[PDB]
Amino acid sequence: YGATSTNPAKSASARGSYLRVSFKNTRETAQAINGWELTKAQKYLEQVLDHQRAIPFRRFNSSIGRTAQGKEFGVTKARWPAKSVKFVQGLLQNAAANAEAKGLDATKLYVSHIQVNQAPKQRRRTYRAHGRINKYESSPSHIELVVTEK
Amino acid sequence: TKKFKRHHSDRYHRVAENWRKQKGIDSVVRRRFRGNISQPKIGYGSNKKTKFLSPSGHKTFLVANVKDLETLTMHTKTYAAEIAHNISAKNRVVILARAKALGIKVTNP
Amino acid sequence: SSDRRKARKAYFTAPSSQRRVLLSAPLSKELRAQYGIKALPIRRDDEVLVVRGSKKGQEGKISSVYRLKFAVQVDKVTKEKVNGASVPINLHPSKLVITKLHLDKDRKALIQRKGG
Amino acid sequence: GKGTPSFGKRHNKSHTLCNRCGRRSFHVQKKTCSSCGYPAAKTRSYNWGAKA
Amino acid sequence: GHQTSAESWGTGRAVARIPRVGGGGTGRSGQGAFGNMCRGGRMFAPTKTWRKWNVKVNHNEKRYATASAIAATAVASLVLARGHRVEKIPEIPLVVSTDLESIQKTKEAVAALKAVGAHSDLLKVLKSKKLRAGKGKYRNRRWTQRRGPLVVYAEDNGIVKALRNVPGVETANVASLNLLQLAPGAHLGRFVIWTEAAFTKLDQV
Amino acid sequence: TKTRKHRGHVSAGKGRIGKHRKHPGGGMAGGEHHHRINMDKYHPGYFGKVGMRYFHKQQAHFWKPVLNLDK
RNA sequence: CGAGAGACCGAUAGCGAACAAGUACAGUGAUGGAAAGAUGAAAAGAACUUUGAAAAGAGAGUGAAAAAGUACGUGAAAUUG
RNA sequence: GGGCGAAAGACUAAUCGAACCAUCUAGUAGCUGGUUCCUGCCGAAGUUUCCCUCAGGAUAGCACGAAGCUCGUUUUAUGAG
RNA sequence: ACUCUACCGUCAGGGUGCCCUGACGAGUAGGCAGGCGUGGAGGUCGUGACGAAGCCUGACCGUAAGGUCGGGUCGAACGGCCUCUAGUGCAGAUCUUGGUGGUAGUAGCAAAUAUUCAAAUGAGAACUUUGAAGACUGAAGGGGGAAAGGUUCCACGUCAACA
Structure with missing residues (x-):
């Protein structure tokens, strides 16, 4: 996970570990909802999952397009993730559901933690030419979503 | 004051930083230099006069188990006057109730 | 011999004759003071x-x-x-x-056979 | 390249399996066997067939 | 080590010139037993049964060494220092009569050593010994009987079994009275209890 | 068996770095000429024959006692 | 086949292999051949209640302790909040 | 060292100018590279007679280590550019 | 350096215990001496479940060597004394046993035979399946036997690993 279950009265979460998923796109999606409260967070993910807005990428580079929708901070670059985002949206859903089970103020709660961990490899192989096998392994993103009492 | 290392420690991690001899041919501290450390000789170090500190220069005596308890003083063993950790907590409390009950300080209560 | 695992070897793959005995437990004090037997x-x-x-x-x-x-x-x-x-x-x-x-029947005669 | 797809022909089937051992150099032509023999005379235990 | 085959190959594939992989070889390296730097190949100095352990010694040092070690018993300070002990400081080594033979049981034996004054060498063991490391934790090296006072017989051959069974004792003869029975663990001065007939058999060298 | 001096120098049993079979000069050496071995302008080697061998000094040769007149 | 011991190991050691290691597999092929140990006294291995769709999240019971919860010793770092 | 030729040692399981597999075998390398505590006492040499001899080594020059003892400044001449 | 005076290193003499004290002390090979060192052991008592090795962390003498005490914690192992013995100190041969890093979430995503629209079922539908309609081939995208393989067809039944 990373962060603590700060107190089970304040907390409400959901895991989503050992996925075959793009590694940078999970924690970059996590940035733009972390710190932000759950009502702002869920809006941002349902916009970028549909056609509306992008997620401006910051922590990671690569060949990605600079465009008008690069604003989140004073940033130019962005990309618009989709199947990565549908996973993270499910964590906001269950964390908000079980926050009402505690009896907090679920949709208006502060998102304390979300990032992703990795350590062991989930080993998969695919072939290439000349009697060859190259690496074709997945990145196990350990995606959580903790909300705290706010 | 200029601290010592083993050389090439600042480059990579495959260096034991405790002092080894500069073995074969050239090294900056072999042919003698006082800048990028020195080579430790018997010219450096503490002298044939002194040895063994505390804030009152007091030497210890380890009184571990209940073998020889009545040997510990209150003169040169006033400050440092320890027990032994490997020897049980049962024995530790028994020795301390005699040792500190001389008229001395001991670190542990 | 003097060995942990190789002593346990005999206990593990013990025959059915020896497994009669190795279902052991001691006897109580007034069973000893009645008969004599250990276990x-x-x-x-x-x-x-x-x-x-x-x-x-x-x-x-x-x-x-x-x-x-x-x-x-x-x-x-x-x-x-x-x-x-x-x-x-x-x-x-x-x-x-x-x-x-x-x-x-003659567990009566087992415990009092020739030695006892 | 002269090799692998040409070896994928194999119309002439050389070796089948042995009864007693499992050495599958039991040729239909030669009737040889590197292991115990098929057919044999004595048991063909050869000394060079081990290092240790 | 020769339980695998691994060959040289070099560049063109991912293995060195060193015999690592060849005709098999997972973590089993070497062509035969080769590669001590390689794990699962050979050793630097592979231990052998052929190389020596058993060495020679003089016989004229044997009868001198037993005489020297028992001469260290005759001075009281060497005995009571090392590990062995005694209440009775003078008249060492101790000589009793041939009534030592008339002891049957260890219950009588401990009582005899109590009276004469060789009992602080006897009772000295309080706790036992568990194990220690290596072949100390494996085989018969667990419970050890103390080399306390030595008992020495006289009439030869059949020694006393009664004074095998005293806690921390040894039994021996006057003739059979070897090196380790007087000086166990290097340093000298182990307490010896002789009989009357044994101490006159000792009037040789 | 000086483990301290030997392993922490690696000169014991070698000398300087590249000394291989040039230094002992192979192992043995012959009678006459050969290249880079321990032969050279040596004084041993020559004659060869060991023992004071003759047909008188062999079997049935009876030994003398150690027996001086004053001893 | 049994017993005993040697200055003789304690899962990178040593028998191929401590364990379903010749058994999911690979080579025509005597053959090569990995991953791989584990609760407690007693399994009592979480009834019952509550939230979510299963996953997941909280109250409650059992028990010597649940600060022993089944993926069951001690635990560090890159990795990772 | 055989099979084979209108020839190109083309050809024989991607190996053919002598197939491949296994063993003796850990063949061997006069050549090169790598090679694990510290301080103190204390510490040279790149020179030679000589070799079917040359990235070497018998011997000699120079200081290792250990025990027991060992100068010259300069005055009279003599020999040689 | 010159120079003052003290201090550190081995050894000599006078007289033990060692002190006075001369001359010198940049350093690679090399030898000797001295000191610290693992596995193991004759020894083994001492310490231990009222808390042992260990894990982890703090204090932490000063000659370069690496070791005693103390705190959180363990649930059974190991040293006074006294000395002998071995597979005995790591940074490296295009090395060796494995995980993890790197380019990188970047490229690739499988030879240019158009696809458009509606439904059935469902938690989810471009893909299963069905309908409307079009591209496309028809000496084969039609048909069909032997070697070789051997139950892969089939119906039933599942969405986890795995495509």
Whole structure:
């Protein structure tokens, strides 16, 4: 996970570990909802999952397009993730559901933690030419979503 | 004051930083230099006069188990006057109730 | 010989003749003071008691005796289940002591054969 | 390249399996066997067939 | 080590010139037993049964060494220092009569050593010994009997079994009275209890 | 068996770095000429024959006692 | 086949292999051949209640302790909040 | 060292100018590279007679280590550019 | 350096215990001496479940060598004394046993035979399946036997690993 279950009265979460998923796109999606409260967070993910807005990428580079929708901070670059985002949206859903089970103020709660961990490899192989096998392994993103009492 | 290392420690991690001899041919501290450390000789170090500190220069005596308890003083063993950790907590409390009950300080209560 | 695993070798793949004996537990004090014997082997309808343990000096019987397992189910040391069934529950027989010895046909003549 | 797809022909089937051992150099032509022999005379235990 | 085959190959594939992988070889390296730097190949100095352990010694040092070690018993300070002990400081080594033979049981034996004054060498063991490391934790090296006072017989051959069974004792003869029986663990001065007939058999060298 | 001096120098049994079979000069050496071995302008080698061998000094040759007149 | 011991190991050691290691597999092929140990006294291995769709999240019971919860010793770092 | 030729040692399981597999075998390398505590006492040499001899080594020059003892400044001349 | 005076290193003499004290002390090979060192052991008592090795962390003498005490914690192992013995100190041969890093979430995503629209079922539908309609081939995208393989067809039944 990373962060603590700060107190089970304040907390409400959901895991989503050992996925075959793009590694940078999970924690970059996590940035733009972390710190932000759950009502702002869920809006941002349902916009970028549909056609509306992008997620401006910051922590990671690569060949990605600079465009008008690069604003989140004073940033130019962005990309618009989709199947990565549908996973993270499910964590906001269950964390908000079980926050009402505690009896907090679920949709208006502060998102304390979300990032992703990795350590062991989930080993998969695919072939290439000349009697060859190259690496074709997945990145196990350990995606959580903790909300705290706010 | 200029601290010592083993050389090439600042480059990579495959260096034991405790002092080894500069073995074969050239090294900056072999042919003698006082800048990028020195080579430790018997010219450096503490002298044939002194040895063994505390804030009152007091030497210890380890009184571990209940073998020889009545040997510990209150003169040169006033400050440092320890027990032994490997020897049980049962024995530790028994020795301390005699040792500190001389008229001395001991670190542990 | 003097060996941990290679001493346990004989205990593990012991024949059925030796597994009679190795279902052992001590005898109680008034069984020793009646007869003489150290230990005698442990069987189903014996009244049992726990020696060393938190189940300290309680009354019991044995339910089952098992051959290869060595462990016996002990009656009166009874817990339930998740489904709720009051079962007799396992213990190794070294943790036990028997209070019953029967007389029978010629266990009567076993314990008093030629030596006794 | 002269090799692998040409070896994928194999119309002439050389070796089948042995009864007693499992050495599958039991040729239909030669009737040889590197292991115990099929057919044999004595048991063909050869000394060079081990290092340790 | 020769339980695998691994060959040289070099560049063109991912293995060195060193015999690592060849005709098999997972973590089993070497062509034969080769590669001590390689794990699962050979050793630097592979230990052998052929190389020496058993060495020679003079016989004229044997009868001198037993005489020297028992001469260290005759001075009281060497005895009571090392590990062995005694209440009775003078008249060492101790000589009793041939009534030592008239002891049957260890219950009588401990009582005899109590009276004469060789009992602080006897009782000295309080706790036992568990194990220690290596072949100390494996085989018969667990419980050890103390080399306390030595008992010495006289009439030869059949020694006393009664004074085998005293806690921390040894039994021996006057003739059979070897090196380790007087000086166990290097340093000298072990307490010896002789009989009357044994101490006159000792009037040789 | 000086483990301290030998392993922490690696000069014991070698000398300087590249000394291989040039230094002992192979192992043995012959009678006459050969390249880079321990032969050179040596004084041993020559004659060869060991023992004071003759047909008188062999079997049935009876030994003398150690027996001086004053001893 | 059994017993005993040697200055003789304690899962990178040593028998191929401590364990379903010749058994999911690979080569025509005597053959090569990995991953791989583990609760407690007693399994009592979480009834019952509550939230979510299963996953997941909280109250409650059992038990010597649940600060022993089944993926069951001690635990560090890159990795990772 | 055989099979084979209108020839190109083309050809024989991607190996053919002598197939491949296994063993003796850990063949061997006069050549090169790598090679694990510290301080103190204390510490040179790149020179030679000589070799079917040359990235070497018998011997000699120079200081290792250990025990026991060992100068010259300069005055009279003599020999040689 | 010159120079003052003290201090550190081995050894000599006078007289033990060692002190006075001369001359010198940059350093690679090399030898000797001295000191610290693992596995193991004759020895083994001492310490231990009222808390042992260990894990982890703090204090932490000063000759370069690496070791005693103390705190959180363990649930059974190991040293006074006294000395002998071995597979005995790591940074490296295009090395060796494995995980993890790197380019990188970047490229690739499988030879240019158009696809458009509606439904059935469902938690989810471009893909299963069905309908409307079009591209496309028809000496084969039609048909069909032997070697070789051997139950892969089939119906039933599942969405986890795995495509």
